[PDB]
Amino acid sequence: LQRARTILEFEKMLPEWLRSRFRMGELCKVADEDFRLCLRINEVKWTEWKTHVSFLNEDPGPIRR
Amino acid sequence: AAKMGKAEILKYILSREIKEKPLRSLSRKFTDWAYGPVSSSLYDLTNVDTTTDNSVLEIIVYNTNIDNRHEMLTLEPLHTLLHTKWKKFAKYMFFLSFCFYFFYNITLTLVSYYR
Amino acid sequence: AVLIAAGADVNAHAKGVFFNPKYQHEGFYFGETPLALAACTNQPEIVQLLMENEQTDITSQDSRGNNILHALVTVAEDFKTQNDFVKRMYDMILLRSGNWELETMRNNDGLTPLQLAAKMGKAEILKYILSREIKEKPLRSLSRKFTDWAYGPVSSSLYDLTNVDTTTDNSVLEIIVYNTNIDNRHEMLTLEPLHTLLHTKWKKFAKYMFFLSFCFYFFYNITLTLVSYYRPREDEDLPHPLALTHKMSWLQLLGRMFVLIWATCISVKEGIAIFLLRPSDLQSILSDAWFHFVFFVQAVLVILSVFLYLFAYKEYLACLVLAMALGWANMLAYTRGFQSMGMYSVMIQKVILHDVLKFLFVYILFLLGFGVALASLIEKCSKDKKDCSSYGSFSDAVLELFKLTIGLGDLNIQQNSTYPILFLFLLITYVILTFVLLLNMLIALMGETVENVSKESERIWRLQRARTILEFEKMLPEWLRSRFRMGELCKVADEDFRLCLRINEVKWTEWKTHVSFLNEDPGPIRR
Amino acid sequence: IQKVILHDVLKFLFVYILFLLGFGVALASLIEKCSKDKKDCSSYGSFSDAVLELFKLTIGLGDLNIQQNSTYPILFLFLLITYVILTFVLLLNMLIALMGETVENVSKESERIWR
Ligand code: NA
Ligand code: NA
């Protein structure tokens, strides 16, 4: 918490155009039209094996090419 | 959920995996690709980081009145995002503020002891 | 099974930018054979399906030279974060079709899959690989364990020991002891063929080669002590670092050539020992190569005193006195052989790293910080005892304030200047800061760690005497007459009488009829 | 009181004597100096004086002096602050933490041993 109190203070006292992008920007959600709402990436591990129904891409790990 | 301090409803609101496909639009979570036990999750982040006014990271950090702030920053879109914002601009802006202040007190020290 | 009967390729090796290093990046190194991710992703029914197919290869290597078994070793991580099917997927694939040929196979970088359990640090698969009791008699040949005789609750076990002890190159005891990169070394030496074998190798040659190295070094520092306290001095500024006595009564001639030989021999031995392993700046230079480093600092520091005699510096006594104080403090290394002092020598080693090193950075910041403030008041043109020839600088305000932690004498708040209810204020600020707050942190902080470390301080000590036995055995270039083992005792085969063995014991529970046995119930050798 | 003269201070007194004797000879090899301590013709300043001036640093001594002594007194001051860091703040404070672990381990069965 105590280093969380400083990061939101330095980011508030940084009046640039905020070039530092922390996030995947404008990556697609599941819709025919709604391509918005910039995103984040994390990882999962071993248990609870199941067939995977909902997915976004045809199994790459990074961006394709 | 943030300002009242209700932690258990806030663990649900950030993930909210929706299995059924006709209404997967309203989820805050998407499995990008799986291939087995190494799947790449993806959180929504539309009202979380300080990019608008009064976002849910700015409430839960700056707040009084709650004894449950330090536990609620364990949650997943709030946890990795503080790691990223530390990684690319805070680590310098903290160590430069250290260097601007460690060099400050030496200049106050030498002028009031030596001469 | 439709696609298998259709005629798909069962042996297709998928290369690419998976098996990426950094598991976080895309990453699923599983071997790349189609048999492997059947076994790797916990699919036991389809493991049976691929093994029934006669077209399926089992022996086929991969991009890293790895077979089926090298891949299945390097995915386990724990018992906790898995159902532990890797132990039974390992067993299902050997018995289904297996000779020794699939086990002995080395990979691209020349590494047995037994050794791959060691260097990767997979502990749970390594408990299985050393025992591996095989019940069914047509394939008891591939076991690493044999019940010799039972007679009830006192049965005599027997471990295989074919690639374990340092009798070949790069054996699984030599990996797991000398290794960095793992936090799981001290737990893995609890396992049975690794545990009793260190007890045997300690019993017959290490106990002497450790206590003789103690006697060769305790008698060393006394000869360095007496020559630099009793007779350095004769009347002039003649340097004379190690006394000679060219005249009769051969004592200092014998004493000088005693030190200069043993200082060189302890330098060349450690100078090759430190030029074997590369630490990384912390945590590996501080645990395994610390007393390799402390001896080497002492050894160069003694032979440097000879070159202080070369053309007569001023440092011939001031350097050699540092070798004496450090020469007694590293005697605390050689009390590693004892048991009860062994646990004490890790709870003194860990708390100079964990609790007082955090302390000395905080305490110096208060020592220096209040140090300048009292020094800025002390000047006063009245400073301390007629300040014309006397003192009263900054360091005097450190020596009058470092002495407030221990007994000083009289704490004076007298003749000093402009506002002595500020000079009295910063003094009682300092005693409240570090006499009653910041020193008494340390007893409470040490009290938390020594009940956190001394639940596993024993096994860390077992590692530290394991680091010495494999060093003395490596520095013993004889023909190794000391036999630690039953030699060439028979395995269960018509022809294969080889693979020298080991003996251990079992006790009361789980009563059963004894099927597999080697002899008709003797306890020792017959006759 | 009977078990901790066997279990904790007996490990202590072997380690502390090794630092008492070990730094004892090193300060004794510097103290001689032909200036040793208060007109060294009839007076003293042998090895045991460098033990009595250094056994007294555990308890109250009087004045710790770093004065008139010889060739490099930023080594004589260095070994003194080496000793106080070794046994005033490290090796004595082991013992309270070590005793604190045993008397909650023995005093669950200290009654029956008394019986
Ligand atoms: Na305590
Ligand atoms: Na005192």
Q: Which residues face C504 on adjacent strands?
A: C157
* Sequence-ordered alpha helix ranges (H) in B1-115: 8-15, 56-62, 69-72, 76-85, 91-110
Structure tokens at C483: 């036999």
Q: Which residue of B has its CA nearest to C27?
A: B38
Q: Are strands C504-505 and B40-41 parallel, antiparallel or unpaired?
A: unpaired
Helices (H), C132-206: 172-178, 185-188, 192-201
DSSP conformation letters of C95-125: HHS--THHHH---TT---HHHHHHHHT--HH
Asked if residue C158 lies in contact with residue C146, where contact means CB atoms within 8 angstroms, the answer is: yes
Optimal mutation site among C26, C46, C72, C75, interface A, most CBs of chain A within 10 A: C26
Query: C233: which 2 tokens?
Result: 């001095």
Does A15 lie at the interface with C, CB-CB under 8 angstroms?
no
SS (H, E, C) C479-515: CCCCCCCECCCCCCCCCCCCCCECCEECCCCCCCCCC
Interchain CB distance below 8 Å, B49 and A14: no
Q: Which residue has the tokens 């044999």?
A: C146
C-beta atoms surrounding C395 within 10 Å: 14
Pairs of CB atoms within 8 A across A/B: 119
- Chains touching B (3+ CB pairs < 8 Å): A, C
* List of chain B residues whose C-beta atoms are within 8 Å of the C-beta of residue A53: 19, 21
SS (H, E, C) C395-431: CHHHHHHHCCCCCCCCCCCCCCCCCHHHHHHHHHHHH
Report the 10 Å Cβ neighbour count for B46: 15
Token digits of residue C183: 């936090």
CA of C332 to the centre of ligand 1 (A): 26
| Chain centroid offset of residue C153 CA | 37
- Chain B residue numbers with beta carbons less than 8 Å from the beta carbon of C394 are 113
D96 contacts C348? CB cut-off 8 A: no
By the 10 Å C-beta count (0-12 exposed, 13-18 middle, 19+ buried), C131 is classed as: middle
Secondary structure in 3-state letters for chain D: CCCHHHHCHHHHHHHHHHHHHHHHHHHHHHHCCCCCCCCCCCCCCCCCHHHHHHHCCCCCCCCCCCCCCCCCHHHHHHHHHHHHHHCCCCCCHHHHHHHHHHCCCCCCCHHHHHC
Query: Rg for chain C (alpha carbons), in Å?
Result: 33
Please indicate if the annotation marks D60 as binding a ligand: yes
* B77 in reach of chain A (CB within 8 A): yes
Q: Which residues contact C310 (CB under 8 A, 6 or more apart)?
A: none
Residue type for C473, please?
Answer: E
Task: Report which of C361, C284, C297 is spatially closest to residue C329, judged by C-alpha positions.
Answer: C297
Q: Cα C80 to chain center, whole Å? A: 25
Task: Give CA angle at A53 (A51, A54), nearest 5°.
Answer: 140
Please, what's the b/e burial string for D22-59 (b: 16 or more CB within 10 A of its CB; e: otherwise)?
Answer: bbbbbbbbbbbbeebbeeeeeeebebebbbebbeebbe
| DSSP bridge pairs for B29 | B43
Could you give the CA distance from residue C32 to residue C66 in angstroms, rounded to a whole number?
9
Long-range (24+ apart) CB contacts under 8 A made by C144-147 are: C146/C491, C146/C492, C146/C516, C146/C518, C147/C514, C147/C516, C147/C517, C147/C518
Cβ–Cβ under 8 Å, residues B13 and B28: yes
Asked if C23 has any chain B CB less than 8 Å from its own CB, the reply is: yes
Structure solved via: cryo-EM
Contact of A52 with chain C, judged by CB distance below 8 Å, is answered with no
Residue D96: both structure tokens together = 């309270």
Chain A: closest CA distance from residue C485 (Å): 42
Degrees (nearest 5) of the Cα angle D26, D27, D33? 110
Neighbours of A2 (CB within 10 A): 6
Of A38, A59, A61, the CB nearest to B45: A38
- Ligand number nearest CA of D62 is 2
Taking an 8 Å cut-off on Cβ atoms, the answer to whether A8 and B62 are in contact is: yes
In chain A the first and final C-alpha atoms are separated, in Å, by 39
Rounded Cα gap, residues C135 and C137, in angstroms: 6
Task: Please state, in angstroms and rounded to a whole number, the distance separating the CA atoms of residues C350 and C479.
Answer: 39
User: Closest ligand to C410 CA?
Assistant: 2
* Cβ distance of B41 and A46 shorter than 8 Å: no
Residues C126, C115: Cα–Cα separation, whole Å: 9
* 3-state DSSP percent of chain B in helix, strand and coil, to 5: 50, 5, 45
Q: How far from the centroid of its chain's Cα atoms is residue D80's Cα?
A: 11
Nearest of C469, C124, C292, B76 to residue A41 by alpha carbon = B76
Q: What is the CA radius of gyration of chain D?
A: 19
String of b and e for C279-293 (b: at least 16 CB within 10 Å)? beeeeebebbbebbe
Are the CB atoms for C141 and C97 separated by under 8 Å?
no
To the nearest whole Å, the CA of C22 is away from the closest chain B CA by 12
Which residue reads 């920007």 in tokens? A25
Residues of A in contact with C81 (CB under 8 A): 45-47
Q: Which residue of C has its CA nearest to A42?
A: C24
By Cβ distance, the residue of B36, B38, B113 closest to C372 is B113
